[PDB]
Amino acid sequence: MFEARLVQGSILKKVLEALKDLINEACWDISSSGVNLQSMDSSHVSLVQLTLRSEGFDTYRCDRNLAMGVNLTSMSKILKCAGNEDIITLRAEDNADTLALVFEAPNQEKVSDYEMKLMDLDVEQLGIPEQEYSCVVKMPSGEFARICRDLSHIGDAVVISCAKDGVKFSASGELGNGNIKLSQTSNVDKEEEAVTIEMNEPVQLTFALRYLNFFTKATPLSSTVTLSMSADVPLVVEYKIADMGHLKYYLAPKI
Amino acid sequence: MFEARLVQGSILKKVLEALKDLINEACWDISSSGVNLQSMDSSHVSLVQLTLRSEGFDTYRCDRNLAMGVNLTSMSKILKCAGNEDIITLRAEDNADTLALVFEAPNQEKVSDYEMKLMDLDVEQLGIPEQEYSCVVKMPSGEFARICRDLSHIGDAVVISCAKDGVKFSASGELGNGNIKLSQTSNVDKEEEAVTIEMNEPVQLTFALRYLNFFTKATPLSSTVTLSMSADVPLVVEYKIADMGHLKYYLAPKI
Amino acid sequence: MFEARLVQGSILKKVLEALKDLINEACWDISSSGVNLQSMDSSHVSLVQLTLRSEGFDTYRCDRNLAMGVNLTSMSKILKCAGNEDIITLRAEDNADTLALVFEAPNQEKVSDYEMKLMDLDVEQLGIPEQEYSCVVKMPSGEFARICRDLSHIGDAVVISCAKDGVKFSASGELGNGNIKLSQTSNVDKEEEAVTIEMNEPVQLTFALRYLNFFTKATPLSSTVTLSMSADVPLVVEYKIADMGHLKYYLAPKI
């Protein structure tokens, strides 16, 4: 059987709120290594890459390999019933037609046992190889969420330019245009981070803000976010689920 | 004349927010004992039983008996104008065509004097006799509100089963089904209560979650809620207005 | 060129949220004295009078006179992108077709540079002379906002009566009527203010609550609000932008 016990049930709730707005039909690849998820949106522009290691689960147990076709919108409704401190436990059988969901209160008074039906998926699997990117921008997750939200009111697409000085976001629309230059000033404070970059070569691409707004739904999961981009390759937005795995977001450039 | 002065005006605001979603046409039975209200919904499945003792009012004064046909939705709009710490004073005459509503600020700077027109009611009165119930479940008011809200996403009806071990809530719908078993674990903490029960005999009935969601609108009124149920009799949900009275909610079983 | 630097960028955000609901087509009169704005609504019942002194700007610089026809709704969308502590800098040229908007983070890491297109206005200018009013009521800004909001549920118009004792607000509508008498009780507390008045002669006029609700959008700007009114003259609602200027709101009496 499959049995994964997560003490921090808040993590799984934050994960599912990050996918349901982008995708609603995906497959959960379950193995001894951990949980994996790979799916695209309707228009096949973006891709999700979820990984949850078994080393992070309080109690992991998987006999054979599993591939669970799960409706995310349905699952998100169920995981809305779980509390923040509630210990969430997923439990499938090896011939699983359904998937159980155990929401356990800390003191074990309120024990909830949900049961979600699976479905058959005609899935097309995507194998993305490892690439070395020209630029890797590290920034606060709340910072990137505001930038994408503010430029959404300006235009439909964002021009991201990168150099050695810093990264500049640009948008143009109806009421005009705006520019957000992210630099690395030298001040004196505490842990407020900035925006370190590992530029090998300057890049300048354009991306859709609609899908970037879907990516910022994984904000609560991580304190900071890395955006790795390179000429003629899709941009990767990564939210690292600390001590569990990571949530990558691939996105193709425009035109 | 009728004159009732309530120092804690927040209570009356919490009371009216609990009825307006269930009923909008009810009669206020006023006497020397206190305030009483008894009315059913449109479909005559549920009943409200409000009681406010005169022993709890800062200043109660009733010459003769009164029966005031009051539009609750209209009254709820007016009582939305009262502050939280505002001393609310209700004042009718003995031949009342209208009902006055005095909202007094603590320091007596902001004094508001509202006037609401009454209406004639073709009311059908209901006399419910006292019954001894098979099971009385005591639980936090915020706990019962979450259970009813979470199962609402599952199905339309909830199967409540009771025993000696504990109480189990069940629902089944489109995306699947869920079960919430409330037990009495033995841990070590403080005043976090659990769910004591006085079962004489195990009961199992089914109720509508739509009307139960109307009942949980009386949450702010009480810290805990009692649900007394018995085979072939309507379930009673009671929110005790401390040092004032109680707000009962009768509900007929399904099928 | 025109260059105004405001350290407290929150003020400008609060200003624009107060106009956009009342008016959306106005002209910004820029001179060495400071910023001025004078415009009416569609139905020409109310008038806005914004004044921001150059003595309050961290860095003011205006070569020649300027009159900028600015879409307020467009500008409000842009100023929604500015942070609370962000240092906002407005910068036009002397032949300005557009208007720049510099949003500078304190530590100067996040620097945003927006650009808004101006437009030609067929504006009708209004010269209001200084008048001595019969009554000037001083009250908390949050107090006046609640009074206008509560009477909005009652009726469409508010009857404001003034005397030596205090000021009384009255409204009548469908579910009935209400009265709010503001007096000056003698208690013992701290800085909770009340409602001082400089009545020369008692006044009683009627005004629309729809436009008064548009005026209360300038609440965050000031702690207290002054309402100066006089028989047969329009009522003036003033929100004083401390150490910067003031935001007046003229409103014609009904009938």
Swiss-Prot record, chains A, B, C:
GO BP annotations listed: base-excision repair, gap-filling; cellular response to hydrogen peroxide; cellular response to UV; cellular response to xenobiotic stimulus; chromatin organization; epithelial cell differentiation; estrous cycle; heart development
CDD domains in UniProt: PCNA
Chain residues forming the annotated DNA-binding region: 61-80
MF term (GO), any: nuclear estrogen receptor binding
Disulfide bridge positions per record: 135-162
SUPFAM superfamilies reported in the protein's UniProt record: DNA clamp (SSF55979)
Keyword set, alphabetical order: Acetylation, Deafness, Disease variant, Disulfide bond, DNA damage, DNA repair, DNA replication, DNA-binding, Dwarfism, Host-virus interaction, Isopeptide bond, Methylation, Neurodegeneration, Nucleus, Phosphoprotein, Ubl conjugation
Covalent link Glycyl lysine isopeptide (Lys-Gly) (interchain with G-Cter in SUMO2), residues: 164, 254
Pfam families to which the protein is assigned, alphabetical: PCNA_C (PF02747), PCNA_N (PF00705)
Gene3D superfamilies: 3.70.10.10
Effect of residue 228 to I: In ATLD2; a hypomorphic mutation affecting DNA repair in response to UV; results in significantly decreased interaction with FEN1, LIG1 and ERCC5
The keyword Disulfide bond appears for this protein: yes
PTM note: Phosphorylated. Phosphorylation at Tyr-211 by EGFR stabilizes chromatin-associated PCNA. Acetylated by CREBBP and p300/EP300; preferentially acetylated by CREBBP on Lys-80, Lys-13 and Lys-14 and on Lys-77 by p300/EP300 upon loading on chromatin in response to UV irradiation. Lysine acetylation disrupts association with chromatin, hence promoting PCNA ubiquitination and proteasomal degradation in response to UV damage in a CREBBP- and EP300-dependent manner. Acetylation disrupts interaction with NUDT15 and promotes degradation.
PROSITE patterns (UniProt xref): PCNA_1, PCNA_2
Modified residues (Phosphotyrosine): 211
Entry similarity comment: Belongs to the PCNA family.
Subunit: Homotrimer. Interacts with p300/EP300; the interaction occurs on chromatin in UV-irradiated damaged cells. Interacts with CREBBP (via transactivation domain and C-terminus); the interaction occurs on chromatin in UV-irradiated damaged cells. Directly interacts with POLD1, POLD3 and POLD4 subunits of the DNA polymerase delta complex, POLD3 being the major interacting partner; the interaction with POLD3 is inhibited by CDKN1A/p21(CIP1). Forms a complex with activator 1 heteropentamer in the presence of ATP. Interacts with EXO1, POLH, POLK, DNMT1, ERCC5, FEN1, CDC6 and POLDIP2.
Pathological condition linked to this protein in its record: Ataxia-telangiectasia-like disorder 2: A neurodegenerative disorder due to defects in DNA excision repair. ATLD2 is characterized by developmental delay, ataxia, sensorineural hearing loss, short stature, cutaneous and ocular telangiectasia, and photosensitivity.
Protein name as catalogued: Proliferating cell nuclear antigen
Record organism: Homo sapiens
